[model samples]
Target: METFAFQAEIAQLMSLIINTFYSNKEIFLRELISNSSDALDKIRYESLTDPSKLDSGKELHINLIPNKQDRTLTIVDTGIGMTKADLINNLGTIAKSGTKAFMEALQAGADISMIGQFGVGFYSAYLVAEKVTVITKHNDDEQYAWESSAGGSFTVRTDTGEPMGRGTKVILHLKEDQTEYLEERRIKEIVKKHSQFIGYPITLFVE
Candidate 1:
């Protein structure tokens, strides 16, 4: 696994966001789901002129799976997946411009680096999860996985599991205090409160 450290400023901000700002940890679910919806919408709109972009043979939906045994909650979305480069640029460092620079770099086969200038909802995972594993596959790149515990550093590796046709799967190992997210009822409530009428289906499964 290749590893990198978060920027000095981001390290400070992350602690504030994870420990101070968000009083309700449940909002993490809402943030991630909203991000998933945005991804689905982006791909859907792009596919309007180029149908091949949606050839992943998957529809737009967010699947939430909770495992009491593993003490993990996984959120999967069938949308525009991130490439290895995207993972590094987006996760390892935060781009204030966010998607515009990201897409431009993706097209030009370039890499951009900067400190955390924007809030990318993905970090909200740290509120409930002590560690997180992101498995993603993009049409233009191979499958890859990114792992982090928000300890100032993160690791990236070639995915060893079955390849995801398209989109992202985030597995969060719940913190001791955040175990309530493992309950089906609790998960549903959060989804209903924040994601009920989103443009796509948000399915929850608990085990």
Candidate 2:
């Protein structure tokens, strides 16, 4: 039930050139999926060491839903979800070291191919989306929503919808010109090109 403005660092960066540029538009999808893989890897590794904390017989996978009705592309993953502070720091704070922290922690026994270690890759969504919504749950925090237009600020609020358990669901409100990303064929093609070798299953919903 609260909305914190983006920190000075994020606001300042977003103000400069968030909208006018993005070198590789298709790369955004790849980056986002890479991020999902890392998150799933995190929870899987956590399960091996802390068997009591993980749910039994749960599948670690990514789900993609392209909704023409809403002009949104949703990517869901069963992973180590984030807390409110993590939402701000991870999505808002720029150039912070969370990526390295995640990498160093999971790199030992996790998949070495889980790329996009830069962490900033999440912002790549702005290349195709006017607004991005992240609904997530974490072991230490309640479910919450983080949203932003990559303008000067972002908002965070508690989510009251059905529990997502421990994972993240990102909804991208695609820009008017980027609607092609909503096509099932288009998304699958891109995924095949960049993520065909990904360790987890990535399911895409056409409807």
Candidate achieving the largest TM-score? 1
Off by over 4 Å in 1: 90-118
lDDT tens readout by residue for model 2, 5-33 = 65554454344325445455777789888
Error of 1 at 163 (Å): 1.4
* TM-score of every prediction relative to native: 0.85, 0.83
RMSD to the true structure for each prediction, in A, is 7.5, 6.2
Report the lDDT tens digits of candidate 1 across residue range 57-151. Answer: 55889899999889999999988888988888754455334434444443565322211113456766777888989998888898899988876
| lDDT, candidates in the order shown | 0.77, 0.77
Clashing pairs in 1: none
Runs off by more than 4 Å, candidate 2? 15-17, 89-117
